[PDB]
Design a protein around this ligand. Structure first.
Ligand SMILES: [Ca+2]
Length: 221
């Protein structure tokens, strides 16, 4: 997260860290048994770290749970990072408490202008922001016109841009798979962008609201 601030500890209880020897992606707990992440964050097996704030220090609020199923969306296509969404099933249910709480899926899609929050332990591109401590950033959803203008013909029905065309504030490498919460529900998954916080290159996120049927279907299976 570039241009953001350190989140109040545990203010994003759905935020998880995907670990395979080190932190490589974010994710969002959507219930006691499932985590929503990006398909480009795929790995046959991953460690899901919940209840984290400082991923480098043991705080006692953590729960480390290994995945038992990792399912990339069937229409995921890496060449254009389309349908970049993935479900991770926990081998054992997470214990819901003060530090671990699921985020609700969207009842409907959020329109351009909606102010949301994105968080993660990714690159901060700043000597002041400590990526080891969960970073938070408020970003507004951009209009399709501005999104497509930034990346001509590269925006699909499964994507939306959020952030500032002026640069300085955006998600980044390491935040991938993480959440974009708008008014309490999960509208996006950190997916891609040219660089980070670069003028004219806003963040692109997987549009969670159109994946409800697949999400609920799969989690029941
Ligand atoms: Ca920790």
């Amino acid at each position: 997260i570039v241009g953001g601030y350190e989140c109040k500890a545990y203010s994003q209880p759905h935020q998880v860290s995907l670990n395979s020897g080190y932190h490589f992606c974010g994710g969002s707990l959507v219930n006691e048994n499932w985590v929503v992440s990006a398909a480009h964050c795929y790995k046959s097996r991953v460690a899901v770290r919940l209840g984290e704030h400082n991923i480098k220090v043991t705080e006692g609020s953590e729960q480390f749970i290994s995945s038992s199923r990792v399912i990339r969306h069937p229409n995921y296509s890496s060449y254009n990072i389309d349908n970049d969404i993935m479900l991770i099933k926990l081998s054992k249910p997470a214990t819901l408490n003060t530090y671990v709480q699921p985020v609700a899926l969207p009842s409907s899609c959020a329109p351009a202008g909606t102010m949301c929050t994105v968080s993660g332990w990714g690159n901060t591109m700043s000597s002041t922001a400590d990526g080891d401590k969960l970073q938070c950033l408020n970003i507004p959803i951009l209009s399709y016109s501005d999104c497509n203008n930034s990346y001509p013909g590269m925006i699909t029905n499964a994507m939306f841009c959020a952030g500032y065309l002026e640069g300085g504030k955006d998600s980044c490498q390491g935040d991938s798979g993480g959440p974009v919460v708008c008014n309490g529900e999960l509208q996006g998954v950190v997916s891609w962008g040219y660089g980070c916080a670069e003028p004219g290159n806003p963040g692109v996120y997987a549009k969670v609201c159109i994946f409800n049927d697949w999400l609920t279907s799969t989690m029941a299976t």
